[PDB]
Amino acid sequence: MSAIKPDMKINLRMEGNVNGHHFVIDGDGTGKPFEGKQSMDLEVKEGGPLPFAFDILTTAFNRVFAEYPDHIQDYFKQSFPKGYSWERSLTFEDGGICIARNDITMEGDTFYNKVRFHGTNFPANGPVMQKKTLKWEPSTEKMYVRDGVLTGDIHMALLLEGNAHYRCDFRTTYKAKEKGVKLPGYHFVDHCIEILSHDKDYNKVKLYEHAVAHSGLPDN
């Protein structure tokens, strides 16, 4: 009923535009759905070298890849073989705003990902456009249903030069392709995302995420 393997390939193409700058990015990677770990090699095919911080894009490059325990419904693994899509708002504290789409589908041992990323109102002297971002801090997503739709909220923070932080609020909606796929209870998903290596101008990046679901206190 699932057909999600313990090892899967990941195939991804992103087209997008931030502060007027258009780009295209390709990803080929591998992951381990049931351990909640994945890794990806990203390559810019148009719009390079990007005039903005690469970190803003990186959560755009699948909650399938998260370790769900048994007492929590796993909507993402239950949305296959047919797949699902998500939509995200990234509200930055200094007025920068991004919206994002991923349409996720499966052929054999490979997830396919049609991704769209649009950003604006980023200040010219901000960390994004000055490229002063170091990494996303690990996070904790909250998952809840709001009018028959699974929703994730995250207080994200980008570490900057000098250990300052640049805030971002995520809200993501998640939508199974198949009707009447069972919504889960209110729960959490810890994340940690990480650029493992990158070339100088970020035309080549190697990314890794690790995520695990939990009920919160007292259970976790």
Ligand X SMILES: O=S([O-])[O-]
CB of 96 to ligand X, least distance (A): 25
Give me the residue whose beta carbon is nearest to ligand X. 218
Residue 108 or 216: the one with the smaller Cβ distance to ligand X is 216
Q: Which residues bind ligand X (CB under 6 A)?
A: 192, 194, 210, 218
Residue 38 or 78: the one with the smaller Cβ distance to ligand X is 38
CB of 190 to ligand X, least distance (A): 10
Q: Is 135 in contact with 32 (CB distance < 8 Å)?
A: no
Number of helical (H) and strand (E) elements in the chain, helices listed first: 1, 12
CB of 115 to ligand X, least distance (A): 23
Q: Which residues contact 113 (CB under 8 A, 6 or more apart)?
A: 10, 11, 12, 13, 27, 61, 62, 102, 103, 104
Number of neighbours of residue 46 by Cβ within 10 angstroms: 9
CB of 196 to ligand X, least distance (A): 8
Residue 180 or 218: the one with the smaller Cβ distance to ligand X is 218
Which amino acid belongs to residue 205? V
The two three-digit tokens of residue 84, written as one number: 């699902």
CB of 194 to ligand X, least distance (A): 5
Q: Is 188 in contact with 220 (CB distance < 8 Å)?
A: yes
Residue 157 or 192: the one with the smaller Cβ distance to ligand X is 192
CB of 192 to ligand X, least distance (A): 4
Number of neighbours of residue 22 by Cβ within 10 angstroms: 11
Q: Is 54 in contact with 44 (CB distance < 8 Å)?
A: no
The two three-digit tokens of residue 102, written as one number: 């991923």
**Radius of gyration of the chain measured on its C-alpha atoms:** 17
Residue 63 or 191: the one with the smaller Cβ distance to ligand X is 191
Residue 55 or 176: the one with the smaller Cβ distance to ligand X is 55
